[PDB]
């Protein structure tokens, strides 16, 4: 099956492109560089079976960075409550949330 010629010869045919935290041109970082770095350093050397249980926190954080599902849920709840509060009319959002702000540099 897998014949690891790259490991045996130290060739690096395709390993440069496997992860997004790996030596990008001009040191441009991925959106989730820190999360992937943390997850990889957590799961290194302990095997997949152990990593799936013991590095679940780091992987969940990495997935949250990748897809932002919880963030969208929270924002949707906030905007729904705001819409409910404004429809019956007891919120009156501040002037800087309507476009009447004084911008800073």
């Amino acid at each position: 099956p897998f014949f690891d010629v790259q490991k045996r010869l130290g060739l690096d045919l395709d390993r440069w492109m496997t992860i997004q935290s790996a030596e990008q041109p001009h040191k441009i970082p991925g959106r989730c560089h820190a999360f992937e770095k943390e997850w990889i350093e957590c799961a290194h050397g302990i095997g997949g079976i152990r990593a799936e249980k013991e590095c679940k926190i780091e992987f969940d954080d990495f997935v949250e960075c990748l897809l932002r599902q919880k963030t969208m849920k929270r924002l949707s709840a906030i905007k729904r409550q705001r819409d409910k509060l404004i429809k019956e009319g007891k919120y009156t959002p501040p002037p800087h949330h309507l476009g009447k702000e004084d911008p800073r540099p």
Binding site: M17, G30, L66
Partner: protein, 98 residues
Amino acid sequence: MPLVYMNIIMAFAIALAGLLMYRSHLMSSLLCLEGMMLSLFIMSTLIILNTHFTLANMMPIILLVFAACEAALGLSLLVMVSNTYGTDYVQNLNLLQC
């Protein structure tokens, strides 16, 4: 997942259903193959751009290249079949049974 992602995935599913449901022309099925390749290109590009995976930006281009090799292959076969029957109908491909 946003609505754009599921729209691209739906386009892929539609193109796969179009390929798997032959009418008569082999060329129509080849067009469905190209459409599947296009949906894959768009999906992969959107994922790579969203996450700022810089190196992976070369991946969709490569995906295009082997798309052409699949089209040029298929078209080639469509020639030969045509030269046998004067028609690209898939019903003529029935010399071999199960």
